[PDB]
Amino acid sequence: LAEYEKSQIKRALELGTVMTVFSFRKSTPERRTVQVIMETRQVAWSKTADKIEGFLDIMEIKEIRPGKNSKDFERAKAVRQKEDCCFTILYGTQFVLSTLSLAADSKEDAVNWLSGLKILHQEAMNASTPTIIESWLRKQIYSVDQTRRNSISLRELKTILPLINFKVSSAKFLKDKFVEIGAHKDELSFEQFHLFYKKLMFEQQKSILDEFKKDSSVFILGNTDRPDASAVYLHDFQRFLIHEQQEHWAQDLNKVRERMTKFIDDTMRETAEPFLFVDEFLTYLFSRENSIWDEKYDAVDMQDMNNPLSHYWISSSHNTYLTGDQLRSESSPEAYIRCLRMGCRCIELDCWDGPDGKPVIYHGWTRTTKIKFDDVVQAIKDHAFVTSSFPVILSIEEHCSVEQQRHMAKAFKEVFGDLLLTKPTEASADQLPSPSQLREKIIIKHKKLGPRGDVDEHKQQGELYMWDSIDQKWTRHYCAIADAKLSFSDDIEQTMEPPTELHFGEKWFHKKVEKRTSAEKLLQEYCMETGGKDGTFLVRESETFPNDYTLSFWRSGRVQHCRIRSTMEGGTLKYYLTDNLTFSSIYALIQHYRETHLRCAEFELRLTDPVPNPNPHESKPWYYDSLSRGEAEDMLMRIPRDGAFLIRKREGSDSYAITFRARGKVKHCRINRDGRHFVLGTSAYFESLVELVSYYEKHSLYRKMRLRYPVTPELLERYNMERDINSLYDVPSMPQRTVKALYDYKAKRSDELSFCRGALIHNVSKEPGGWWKGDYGTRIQQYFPSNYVEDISTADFEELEKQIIEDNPLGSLCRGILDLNTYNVVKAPQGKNQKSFVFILEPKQQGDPPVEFATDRVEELFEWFQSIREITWKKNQSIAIELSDLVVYCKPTSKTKDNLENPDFREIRSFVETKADSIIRQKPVDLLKYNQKGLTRVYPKGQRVDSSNYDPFRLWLCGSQMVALNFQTADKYMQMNHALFSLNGRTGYVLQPESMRTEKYDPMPPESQRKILMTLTVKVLGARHLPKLGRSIACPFVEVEICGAEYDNNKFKTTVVNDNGLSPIWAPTQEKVTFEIYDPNLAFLRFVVYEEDMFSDPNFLAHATYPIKAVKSGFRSVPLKNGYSEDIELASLLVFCEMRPVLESEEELYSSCRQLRRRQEELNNQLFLYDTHQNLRNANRDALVKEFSVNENQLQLYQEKCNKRL
């Protein structure tokens, strides 16, 4: 359409239409006003203008599907609707996209909507960062106040600041900023809010400009930048690009002008030479077009797509239909759509027997929602080539019968048709044809009819109800029987969820009004809570008026009280305040008071202050005012199960330490009642302790464990009887806290410790502030920063636990193992505890409580009972030729699975992770030679029931191109996979370099052969928009690391910034960090931002996986993605990247830098000679001190030497 036509479409969008919306949660579709607020960039659905039901970020839109093709559109009401007037918006950062399904009334409305959203999404990637900052500010403002207010208040600001993850330094600070902006009745406008933002971000991180304020490349001439008013010019910016960012296109001034006028995006800047300010320069420093990502790898390169397929890493996925853990995930073809849109070229299809004659796709012999094959194949055809249009190989795991195989083949030949690859592209094939030769071709890998011939197992697993005695319910656990060992996992159900007196004990009013002065002190102490003191009412029990309530209310500058009068009318109570304002129902009292305007000539203002009990904990079970540490410990010995928590008051203290069971440990954490807010940690501000419990029963207090069971006294009793679950738990000492050295830290002061990478430091005491007293050779008990090292404890118990994870039926996630050999089953046909279907496992010894397991069906009860009863007592299938012929390439061959010699390009190697890793350990070069012609499926083993992925990198070096990784997970390795397959324009077909395709290359070269080709020097300087995980404000720290090979993998975290994530600043005094990667192509740069809680445990905030080949030099912004590799709004780091070539002279010097490690590993070996050993001879150890500083200098010198050099 034309630009004015597009404008009319988008204004129709902004106007909004009352349109039908479908949901699987709410069966009835509802008519809601759907409209786009362009300034917030939100598609919002509302019931009225002020009440908006839901938001949808336009940049969050990933896919628009016309018609009824969504799980919301399977409803019967959708059948009455028409497809031309139906569509869905797919949005969200999660793997399964949230689906906003809109059914239309007229086809014109629908087509206008699709066109408008496509235009808005197109301009979404075209929006400059200042515009998205405007949008995000407007989002905060329209989120805190639903009426879409364009003004902001003092308090309100006191609440946005924690929400946008910034800690209010002081009320005086925000007041001062209000003043310099200009505050009228301490209220600001949206533009003044934006100015407030500019001030905060510039002032908080104005020391970034110091790097440009330096005196080597004064070309940029950054100076006088102290104030944001300071500004630069187009010439300054192009000198910055040509020198710091090292941009060759920057030679032309006109391109620089175009980029600058794009970034500023302000019509008022009509200057022939565009100019921006120092604060605006800093905003650019965290902007999208300053991304460290290389854009020339965002475009598909045809010369890199014309080569035999064996030389192409191809993005593959394991059990792709699954959306969560393999045990109970909900299979959906939308997962296939998602993976194809990311750019997968291989999706696993576990085709099992179908009751209808059509195979169902799910994880067989497990409890997962089955899906129809035809819907799957339709979805694959629809969205396989909508992105990147390169061939996808369907991973078919055949587990059906021959009739279903005929249906399989005919479905492929019908739905896919020409899309399916049926005949070889060229008959006399010597090798794999290029992906360019395979334009939009469906390749089927599937067990061919090798035996030919003319014409021609599960373990007992499932959910069970374990009879809990703590709560006297039936808690459902997933159980798997492996070698007569039934293992049960955690709760599956856990993820699923009068006219009097009641008002007296309601949130509105609770207790303690024995005198009207008590209410006056209750609400006067509550008067200085907010800015407007008019918002102050309370109901109370009268002291003088008998059997009457009394509204103690504020009145425009003072606190008053008046009795809520009560009468007996019609045999019922009747409370009245005004002559005709009255009711009888208290639950309805709250609502009609909320709608009430406290109207009377006397009373014109309404306030609606739901102020509750100043201390409900006062009357709280988990609250224990007189309970001390010792009492808690003892009583937690009585209840040693994780999730048992009590809030015991410290005697004579406002802090109420929480005694709770964390990993079988009695952990305490004080909650200080600062002012009125109960603060956990440093900034976890809570209204009250009951709110604390309610928030942390669904939020993680400490690692995985959550506040699960409050430990009541009575409880002590119910568990007076114990051993309900037996606490299988995990079924040397820690004075040293043995640590590894992240990087070469130099002794800043004589009490600081000098050492080298990988150094084993012992007798380490964790003094706060990051400085740890540790022993290192002759340097006994010396400081070293916590960021320059890493902790690796001797969790031998945890290792045994991981061995259990290995041989465990459930593998990981198992919450308990019970050996069925040493038990007996008794089946209860009448059942036990209100459950007819019960089988009780009574152990050999009656001393072990018999445990009751319940099912939902009598037949499954019989099956479980039969299996465990048996434990106690102790070519022909003719795979379809019609499907086999469809397998042009990659036909499985189990006969020569171990054979890697004489490879055939038409063959495929299916390997599990452990088998492939073993092959790599034995012979990397042989498998590389095979995959030079052949191909490899490396896929996770059956123990990865939790969708956790393995390390896929060693496989890629050996040429193992096809690595099925579970796309539903959020682990490190899938961020690695997304980083790898984002290369070459996110096509999923990555050409390996020339070295890979030659046999002379060693996939794992010897340490002597390893030579530097890239010694990166990275420097983190600042950040913007670090996301918040929990109530407590994130205390972020960045860890930059090369997760390349076992020689490239190197980590470095930085000093933690406390209570600042909106505009966190790292010290410029930190040293430049050197990553010596011997191979540039096979390496990845990863900035993982974490946050530190009160337990100082890092928690994943975000990641920054980028290929080294894509890494550009300069002061580059680094966009931050979530665990699903999706860019979150405005979250970005800044890094002073420096690309570095290994010159011949540098190489000699880098041979010296290898001499560094060649003898510092022996320096570490002499630290280990006296690691904790003491009965030693001081001959070499003390004489490697020579060695010691010789190496210290040797390197630091020649490194800062090349430093000084470039």
Short mmCIF file of C-alpha atoms in Angstrom, two decimals, residues 17 100 110 177 207 267 368 483 571 583 614 656 667 765 887 960 972 1034 1089 1144 1175:
data_model
loop_
_atom_site.label_atom_id
_atom_site.label_comp_id
_atom_site.label_asym_id
_atom_site.label_seq_id
_atom_site.Cartn_x
_atom_site.Cartn_y
_atom_site.Cartn_z
CA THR A 17 -12.05 -2.27 17.31
CA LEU A 100 -3.33 -13.83 21.33
CA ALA A 110 -8.77 -8.95 9.31
CA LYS A 177 16.02 15.87 40.61
CA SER A 207 32.79 8.16 33.90
CA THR A 267 12.71 16.55 13.14
CA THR A 368 3.03 -36.78 27.01
CA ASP A 483 16.49 -52.70 37.83
CA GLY A 571 -34.43 -9.61 61.49
CA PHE A 583 -25.87 -2.17 53.60
CA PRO A 614 0.11 -3.31 61.42
CA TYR A 656 12.98 -11.46 62.11
CA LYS A 667 19.70 -21.35 57.07
CA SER A 765 38.45 -17.43 54.15
CA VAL A 887 15.01 -41.76 1.84
CA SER A 960 29.93 -33.68 13.58
CA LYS A 972 24.10 -22.59 28.11
CA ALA A 1034 19.60 -7.19 41.15
CA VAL A 1089 25.28 -11.11 33.39
CA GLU A 1144 55.31 -13.03 12.84
CA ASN A 1175 56.46 -32.65 54.66
#
